Every structure is written in C-alpha cells, then in structure tokens.
Amino acid sequence: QVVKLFNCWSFEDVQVNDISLADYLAVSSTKHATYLPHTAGRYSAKRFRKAQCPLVERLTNSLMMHGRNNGKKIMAVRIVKHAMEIIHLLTDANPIQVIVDAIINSGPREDATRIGSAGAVRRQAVDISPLRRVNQAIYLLTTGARESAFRNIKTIAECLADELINAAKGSSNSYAIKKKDEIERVAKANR
Amino acid sequence: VSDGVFYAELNEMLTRELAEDGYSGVEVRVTPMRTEIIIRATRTQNVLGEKGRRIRELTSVVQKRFNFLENGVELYAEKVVNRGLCAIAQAESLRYKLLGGLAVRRACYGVLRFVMESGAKGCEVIVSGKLRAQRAKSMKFKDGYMISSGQPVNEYIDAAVRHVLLRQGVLGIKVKIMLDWDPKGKLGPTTPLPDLVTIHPPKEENEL
Amino acid sequence: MAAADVAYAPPMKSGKIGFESSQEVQHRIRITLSSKSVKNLEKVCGDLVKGAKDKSLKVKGPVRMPTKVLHITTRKSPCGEGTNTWDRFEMRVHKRVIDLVSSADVVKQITSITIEPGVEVEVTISDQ
Amino acid sequence: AVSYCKPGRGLIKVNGVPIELIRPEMLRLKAFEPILLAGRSRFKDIDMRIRVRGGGKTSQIYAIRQAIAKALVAYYQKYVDEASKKEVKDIFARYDRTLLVADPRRCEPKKFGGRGARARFQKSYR
Amino acid sequence: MASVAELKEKHAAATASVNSLRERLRQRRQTLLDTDVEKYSKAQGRTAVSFNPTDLVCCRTLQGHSGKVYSLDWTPEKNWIVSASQDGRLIVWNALTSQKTHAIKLHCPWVMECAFAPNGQSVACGGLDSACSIFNLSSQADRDGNMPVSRVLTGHKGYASSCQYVPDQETRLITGSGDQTCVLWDVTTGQRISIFGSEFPSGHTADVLSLSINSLNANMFISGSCDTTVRLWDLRITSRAVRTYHGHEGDINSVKFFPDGQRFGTGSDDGTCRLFDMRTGHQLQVYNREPDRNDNELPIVTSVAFSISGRLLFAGYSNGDCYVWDTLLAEMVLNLGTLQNSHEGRISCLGLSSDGSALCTGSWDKNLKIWAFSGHRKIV
RNA sequence: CUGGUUAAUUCCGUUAACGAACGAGACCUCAGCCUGCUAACUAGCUAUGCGGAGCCCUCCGCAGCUAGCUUCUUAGAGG
Description:
part of a larger assembly; 5 chains; C: 128 residues; alpha+beta; 21% helix; 20% strand; elongated; E: 380 residues; mainly beta; four-stranded antiparallel beta sheet; 27 strands; 33% strand; RNA-binding
C-alpha cells in the first residue's frame, strides 16, 4: 500500500458527510489522488459537475495569497504541511478529514447578492453553487488564520491549525464558522 | 554590430547623392575595396563624360568619407526594367510638373493612368493640401488593386514619397504601385493561390 | 600498464592544421569563412555551393553550420508626443554562417574567391 | 547492453537517461537524489514511480538535468523512465498510461507588450 | 480490349487526324493480345468441380496502434504480422495470443506502408517524411528499436506512398513514390541505381500509391496509380515500361499480384474492383454489384488480396465490409461483416498470411481482427 | 434590409441585384513549435584514458576535432 501525500497521511479514508458537497470534493483523481503541486487547465463549463478538485491544492493556494504580500507557494505548501501535522497532534485524527469538517461547517447554504432594480437596491438571497461554498469557506478559514497570525505570537501554521480546528468543531471563536452563520442569517432573513 | 554600421552609413550617403537628381535609382554593392554603384538611367552621360576627372571625383569622395582601401573603382551604365518597382524619374517627373503646375488634379489621375496601362493592377498617388493656397485638404485617388499593408509581405509594392517646394507652399507626396516583380517571372500575389484544372476526359493531361 | 598522454596522430589530420601535401608539404591550413547577411533565403544557396567545391577539389571539407543569433530590437512610441501605448517592435535579425574546409589548398582559395556569389552576403577570407 | 533513452522535454532544462537496471538509487549531476533536493515536496513527485508500481529494484536511474531553478527539475525526470518501459513491455503499457505522461505545458512565460507594468497589466493611468 | 461507346462526331479536319493516329496504333495492338482469350474464366467455370466450405470467423481480436491502423503485411515465418499506423508507431505482433514483441516510433503520419523483409529481419515504412527507415529485429531485452543501426536510405521530392521488397534483400527497394518517379535503389550506399520515367496513360505520371512485385523470377513489376493504369515495367532489361492496362475509370489505388503470377487484382477507388490478366492482356473478369438495390454506403473500393490457391479474393472497402468472391466462377461466395452496430468506417488494408491459413484486417475503428480457416472442410 | 452563425459585410441561407476593393482571417512572427530525422558542431551524452577518492568495484576532474550520434545548439523539411 505505502500511502504518499507528504508521506504520512491517507486520503481515501476521508469521509465527506454532505452528499451534495461530496460529489464536488475530489479526494480521488484518475488513478487515485495525491497531493504534490501543479496546475492543469480544465476551465469552467456550467450547469453540471464540471471540474476535478483538490482541497489541499485550494487551501495552500488560499494561504500563499490571503494574506498578504510577499509569500510564495513554496512557503505556503510548507505552512499547510506544518498546519496539518499540528492539527493531527491536537486532534489525533487525519488533518485532511479535519479540513473537510472545517469546510462543511464553514461553507454556507445560501448567500446574498446585491441587485439594483427599479428605484432601489434589494438583496433577495441566492444559491452559492458548491465550488463557491468550498471556497468561501476555505478563504474565511485562511483569512481568519492570516488575521490571527498578524496580531498574535502564534505561528500561522498554528493559526491555520487553530482556525481550522475551531471551524471543524462549530466553535464561534473561528472566523470562518462565525462568518458562515452570519451569511446564512442574512440570506435566510432577507426574503 | 560593426559590419552593421557600414550598411547604415553607406545607405544614407547613396540616398542623399541620389536625391532630386534627374536620372533613376541607385544600388550600391561595395566588394573588397571597390564600388559597383548601379544607376538605372538615360543621363548616364553627365556622370561619365569618359577619361577626364568627372567620374572619379564624385566617387573618391565616398571613400575618403567613410570607407575603404588604396584604390579606384568602376562604374557601369544600365537601362531600367519597366520603371515602377523603384526609380527616382517616376518620382521627379511628377515633381517636374509640380514645378510650373498644370491642372493639379490632372497629374494625379494621369501619372496613375499611365503605369496601369503598363499593367500594374493597382496604383495609388497621394498629394498634400494647400491647393489654391487655402487650408489643407491632402488628396487621394487610387485605382485598381494595390496593398503596402494587410495582404502578404511579398506583394512587391513600389512605394516612395518625394517632395515639392513650390514657391508658396510645400506639396508632399507618396506614390504607390503593385505590378509584376523583379524581371524574370515569380508572381505570387495575395494568398491563397487558387487553381484546379478544367478537364480531365483524359488520356494525356495533368500536373495540376 | 599506466602512463598516458593522448594527442591525435592517426597519422595524419587534426583541426589546427589539417595536414595534406605537397608544395613542400602544405603548412598553411586553418581557414575560417564567416558569412553574414540580413536574409537567409539567399545565404543558404551560396553556402551549399562552398560545401560542393571542397568535395570536387581533392579532399572533402564539411558543410555549413549556422550558429547563434544577433538581435537589436528597438521599440519607440514613435512619437506624438504624447504617444505612450501601441508602440513598436520592429525586430531585426542578422544571421552568421561559418563554413570550413578540412584542407585549405592554394587551389581552393583561388577557385572560391573568383566566382563568389554574395549579393547581400558579406564573406571574409581569414586568417591565422 | 541496457540503455534505452527516449527524450521527453517539458519546460527549460535537459534530462538524458542511460539506465542500467539494479538497486533503487537515484543520481542527479551524478550526486545522490534526496540530498541534492533536500527540503522539497516537489522532489518526492519524482520518487512516486520508483516506489508505487511494485517495482523498487528494477530501476537505478542515472539522471543529469542542467540549467534553471529547483522547481522545474521533477516533471521531466519522471517521463522518460515510463516511456522506455512501454516499448518493451505491452502489459506495462498500463504503467505509462495510468500514471500521467505528456505535457509540453507551453505556458512558460509569455510576451511583454508595451505599456505593461509587468507586461500585460497596463498602467494604473494611462 | 475494352470497347468504347458511340460518341457524337465533330467536323474538324485536324482531329480526324487525331482519331487517325490514335486509333491506328491501338486497334493494330488490340488484334493480337485479344485472340488468346479462348473463353472467360466464368463461362468456362460453369461446369466446375465445387469449392469446399468457406468458414472464416474472427478467431482472435488484437489492439495497440494508437491511431487508425493503415496497413499490414505478414512475415514469411507465418508468425509475425506488422503493422504501421498514422501515429508513426510500427508494431510487430505475434497474432495468436497477440503479444507485442517490438514497437518502434518510426516516423511520419501517412506511414501506410509496412512490409516484411523476405529474410524476416526487418521492416520498412515511411510516408509523409519522404524516407524509408530500416530496422533490424533482435532478441535483446532492452528494446530501443530507434537506434539499432537504422538508416535513412531514401530521399524523394514528396511523400512516400509505396515500397515493397522483391523476393530478395539485395534489391531491398523497388519504389514508386509521390515524387512521381519510380526508382530501383542499391541498399547499403543508398544510391539510386536507375530511375524509370514514363507517362499519363501509360507509365506513371502521378503519384504511385501502390506497386506490387510480380511472382516468379520477379522480372517485372506492376504498379498502380492515379493515371488510372496498371503498368508492368520491364525491370530486367532496358526498362521500357513493358506492358500496361488502363481499364479503370478511377485511381488504381491498389494493385496486388496473384500467387500464380498470372493475374493481378486491381483494386481501385473507382466503384468497381477489376481483374486484369497480365499473360493474355485483357480484362478477364469484372467484379461489380450491378443492382441499384445492392448499393452500400460507398461502392467497392481500395484494396485487394488473394488466397494462396487464388480461388478467393478477400478485399477491404471504404464501406466497412468485405464481399468475398470466387475469382473464376464470378460468384460471390459470401459476405463477411464486422464490428459496429450503427455508423461506418474504412477498412483500409487486408493481407494474406504466407501459408494462407488466415488473413488480418486492420480498420479505422482502432481495432484489428484476424480471421482463420482450419481443416479442409467445415469445422469440425 | 432579412434568417442564422461568429472576435470578424466571417461564412452560409434568402433577397432587385450581380459583382468588385480594402480592413479582418490567410500571411511572416514567437510561445512547446515538438518529434523520429536530414545537416554540422558550439555543447551534451557516451566511450576509452589518467590524476586520485571510498574501501576501474563506486566517484570527481581534465586529456585527444580521439570515436560516434543527440534531447542542447542550429537551419530545413515535414508534422
């Protein structure tokens, strides 16, 4: 067997509980998954399931960027990798499973676009088509970790682990869950 | 770079001497120590004059100017191979009416109206405003085909320019022409090149 | 056993003088011909002809090898002024083609020079 | 004897493989693989096919890649070993095929057109 | 030799001269070759002793060429079949199991020309690229096909369209090529020993898409091309391209000799396949599907091959079937039909084994089948 | 005008029109233009040596246009 993925963690044991979200969360690729970094142009066809994924690719990838300045994906891959081992040592559970718990908790069911029509501006609440859920969620988890790292003596690999474990536990301490249920609260109300 | 310099320095010198000049266009190839300078011209006569002093004094200058090596030179006469594709005379002849005038409009059509008659397939003549010494109004008229730009790089367009110092006022210009190409046959116009065949019944016929 | 210092001596032939004879054994040989034009289409055709000539002469020299590229690309917003976009790359190659013979006879030099096909091709007989 | 070289290419930098089959040691610039690319995840991209296959001792790969950064080096290195095997064995055609092969990519840096502050993000004004 | 239909006369003096010369030479030749034709094979064949059961079926199904399988030729040992495909790949297969021994990534697309050497050593193919590259076969485990002293033997102006070995290695090439010319070559050196160049009818002026080597001494060879002629060229002597038939309306996109050597089957792209008798020098037989109802997607087309006995012609067409014919009788023995259950595709090549036991068909659908007959009579 | 399509009076299908130019595309350009090769070697690989190194087994260096071919380099063709 000899599982790879940084050479320490499996990924075909990782369960996605939300059936709708699961069918867009690729933990398996054409031969099986891996995480080793690249890119691969498949564009953006619509209606249907429409792309292949990796969460782990999105998450490091949110980190290099958000936030902010200066860093690189080699640094970002390193921080995800450090955050994943910090997560495993504080949960004793596969950190790929813990990011899936964080993404499902941090991925709002409904969202709230701002439309001007007639003489005024309404927001009537909208869909959030599941790649957008996955993302809002990752981003908020990353922006939280970034924000926590800016203003605390806590490595961000730790801060990412800290935000990710709080989100993957429903804890309103997390920026990502707190913004998720803020968004669902406005989207549910503005009808 | 230094091999480059010589092409550029030489090219201007051959252009300036070969300016107004009532003759017709002027290649130069400069082989080790010698200049061919090929003039395509009727009034080959004034430049040569045989033996004398004439032929050498103009040359000699170029050498002492910027170039090269303890010798003499050579000079050859030519004709010209249906004039369009390059000259001076073509340019000057329209200036040689744009001296004294003549209906300005007539020259435009007229210089174009010739050349087409010798084939040309398009020709575009173009003249600077300040006709009647009023405000500018540049003129066109172009007949037939003709392109410098869009079609392929190898349409083989003669295009030039010239200038006209009238008394009162400049009358620019830029004549263009696209005809057959440098005398030996080697037509290739405007991509695609079509051709099929007619028929085919067959028993003898084809390549195509 | 051991003790190796390696030279060439097949005999004969090496790149520094490609030995041939006679004329008191020819001790001349190293010529380099570097032929530099604007346009390729013309060059190639001249270049091939040199290769052929060597082949005829007695002892066969190698064909054209055409090496590395010289660009000056200068882009000016030509002017207005003000002109500061939709500016310009007119970009200029000049190309260098270096053709040897294995043996540089008296006879080679003289045939090659007399009838020399350069129109725009600038070709320098060279030189120790 | 044994030495089969099929030369891939995909990004700048050139990998010549002459492979004589034995124990699974890996060289680059004729120097040991993990240690030359010490501290890298992209280094283990290469390592992927000299484990996973169920062949370990069947490839001693001797690799030289010359000229460009740390990152580039892996993607090429890999391709070659697969392609060579496919020619001999038609049953390990499903070795080449299912484990990913073949991208030039062709998206290595792009033209710089004028006005661009980088090349393509035209000025903040004008 | 082929009667021409009444055509409306023109009243020009100059042409009559044209008719004069042309008709004077062709009728004078027509009265000698024609006389030898005692009967036609079909007429004579009526009161024949019968054929045995035909029982070919696909015994095994093979796969591995990347693109469309263009061409095949079987090896003399009865065990290898090669084959070349548009991707540039050349595969040598042993057919029964179907194991792949060798593969070389050869070069061009349009590499529709793989042949087996009489020795068994080598293959040639080539196509777009303008060369034929040779390759020895070895037992070596490593199998880099590409280096083992290959060689670009040939240079043509245009695209190699056909190649074939004679009965020997020493004359490894007899070619007719897109460059138009046809050429005989000496192998090691690669020099063109001689060139044969002739005409529009007659020689071939246009591209040779096939030629086939005559079976005997192999004194002559017949070629086929677009100029709509089947032209045998006298290789052995002065090389006046010797004897010609131009029966066809359309390309004779193919040409294959009988094992007897007596006939060749002209498979052409024009909506018939025809058989031409080289010895008598007249059209012996016509293979055509005369009723308006009996039409397929395309009428019959590109390629032909013979049984060892010569009784059967198995043929590939663009329409995707094979109609099997009794050559002598003129009957169709049978229809063979293969693969899809809707939508067409070319069957471009079909080639007999050396022992004659079986045939391999390659198709654009990207599959191969080998059909075989075992036993004298029906199985079991 | 229309009907459709497309970056594109782009092409098609209609039409009181039938053409026709000029832009666009095509074209020369560069990105991967590669690829098996034809071409030569800068150079690469590879061979053979030899100065040594670990303890010709393994490894570095350079040696001779010395041997050949090649991803590099390079021009072409095709593709």
